[PDB]
Design a protein around this ligand. Structure first.
Ligand SMILES: [Zn+2]
Length: 224
C-alpha cells in the first residue's frame, strides 16, 4: 500500500487521509499527514527539506488535485519544519504553536505565518486555528520539545503524536536533545486522554501503531 513518488513515500490510512514520508541521510524517515476536507487539502508537517516538501505538493496535485488550504507544523525541528519555504513559495498559509515560531530562528527553521495559542487544558484556542476543518490541535505539555503539538483527525480513528509518541517496540524516546524529561510522561498521557477513542496513532519515526504506543512511551518517559 506504499506509493513511491520521487524519493518520498505516501500511504493511504483512511479514505481522506494519507501519511507522507521523507528521508534524510543512516537514512531517517519522518512522517506527516495529508487530509482531504471537501474541496481542499490540509497538511500536517513539512518534509525534512524544501525540495522534498515541494514534491509533497506535486503528489497532492497528481493524486488529489485540490488546493492546499493550510499546513500546520508540530514543532521547530528540521523533520517537521525544514520545508517551510516550499509552502511559503506556493502561497500556502502556515500555522505553528506561537512558541514554535518564537524558537524557529534559534532552531534554524523559518517561522510559520500564523501562531496557535492554547487554553490551560491544552486545547487550541479556536480563533487561532481558522478553518482547521477536521484538524483538532492539542498541546499536551512539554515532552519531546517544549513546543510540541499533536493533531487529531476528526471523523476518523487517527491521531498524530508527532515526535512525542514512539511506537510500542521503541527502545528509546530519542531524540531527547531538546526534551523536558520531567513533564514528558504527563504530556504523553495527556495526548492519550485528549484523543481517547483514537485507535490509529501516527507518529514521526514509526509506522502507525495502536494506543499501546502512547502507554509504552509514557512508561519509558516515567524512567527519565
Ligand atoms: Zn523534534
Amino acid at each position: 500500500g506504499d506509493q513511491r513518488f520521487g524519493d518520498l513515500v505516501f500511504r493511504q490510512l483512511a479514505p481522506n487521509v494519507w501519511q507522507h514520508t521523507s528521508y534524510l541521510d543512516g537514512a531517517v524517515a519522518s512522517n506527516g499527514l495529508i487530509v482531504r476536507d471537501g474541496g481542499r487539502v490540509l497538511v500536517v508537517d513539512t518534509a525534512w527539506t524544501d525540495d522534498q516538501t515541494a514534491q509533497i505538493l506535486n503528489w497532492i496535485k497528481q493524486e488529489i488535485n485540490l488546493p492546499v488550504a493550510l499546513a500546520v507544523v508540530t514543532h521547530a525541528h528540521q523533520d517537521k519544519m525544514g520545508g517551510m519555504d516550499a509552502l511559503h513559495a506556493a502561497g500556502i498559509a502556515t500555522y505553528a504553536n506561537a512558541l514554535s515560531n518564537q524558537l524557529a530562528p534559534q532552531e534554524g527553521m523559518v517561522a510559520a505565518q500564523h501562531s496557535l495559542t492554547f487554553a490551560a487544558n491544552g486545547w487550541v484556542e479556536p480563533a487561532t486555528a481558522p478553518n482547521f476543518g477536521p484538524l483538532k490541535v492539542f498541546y499536551p505539555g512539554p515532552g519531546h520539545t517544549s513546543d510540541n503539538i499533536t493533531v487529531g483527525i476528526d471523523g476518523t480513528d487517527i491521531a498524530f503524536g508527532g515526535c512525542l509518541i514512539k511506537d510500542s517496540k521503541a527502545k528509546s524516546l530519542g531524540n531527547l536533545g531538546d526534551a523536558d524529561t520531567e513533564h514528558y510522561a504527563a504530556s504523553a498521557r495527556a495526548f492519550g486522554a485528549a484523543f481517547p477513542k483514537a485507535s490509529m496513532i501516527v507518529m514521526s519515526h514509526s509506522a502507525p501503531d495502536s494506543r499501546a504506543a502512547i502507554t509504552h512511551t509514557a512508561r519509558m518517559a516515567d524512567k527519565l
